[PDB]
Design a protein around this ligand. Structure first.
Ligand SMILES: [Zn+2]
Ligand SMILES: [Zn+2]
Ligand SMILES: [Zn+2]
Ligand SMILES: [Zn+2]
Lengths: 85, 85
DNA sequence: AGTGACCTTTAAAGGTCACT
DNA sequence: AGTGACCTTTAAAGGTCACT
């Protein structure tokens, strides 16, 4: 299951077995180089029910569990689907 | 282009860019743990035309170009299709 | 604008069988 | 029994768009 939020997970995404929602979130965050601010103490619990309630803490736990930014495509590799040789 | 025989090659197989024929040859050789003997000096040229005329020299150069035996599935992984998680 | 269930696209695995 | 053109299956990458 998903290491950052607990939802159901079929395979690994950007280094960690993740939910479909946390694949999309982590992917859009890095492409847009988004930057967030947590309205509370950076201790927001990130489970399936509270997942969207803080984008900072949800990205913070993304980096903590070990999702790697470099996997989302950048420079030459942007746009191509599937595995890269 | 296929590194062992020169035929056309679409992708990489067991570590080296190879044709379908040399993918199949290399895979069954290792599964059957086959062992060959070269009817001549072990210098037999392996191109597309003479490709099947000596299975030792074609296997000899197969390991030389650098395809690795471990990729074909053994023990736990025998029988399973596709990429491994 | 952001979300995420759903989809296509890849590299590369093995399985198949007319032909030899 | 051996070959190899062809097929299906894997994980995992991006793209979509009704819903919010
Ligand atoms: Zn998730
Ligand atoms: Zn927070
Ligand atoms: Zn070849
Ligand atoms: Zn020979």
């Amino acid at each position: 299951l998903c290491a950052v939020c607990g939802d159901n997970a079929a395979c690994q995404h950007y280094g960690v077995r993740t939910c479909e929602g946390c694949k999309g979130f982590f992917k859009r965050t890095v492409q847009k180089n988004a930057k967030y601010v947590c309205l509370a103490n950076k201790n927001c619990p990130v489970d399936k029910r509270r997942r969207n309630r803080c984008q900072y803490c949800r990205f913070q736990k993304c980096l903590a569990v070990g999702m790697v930014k470099e996997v989302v495509r950048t420079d030459s590799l942007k746009g191509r689907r599937g595995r890269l040789p």
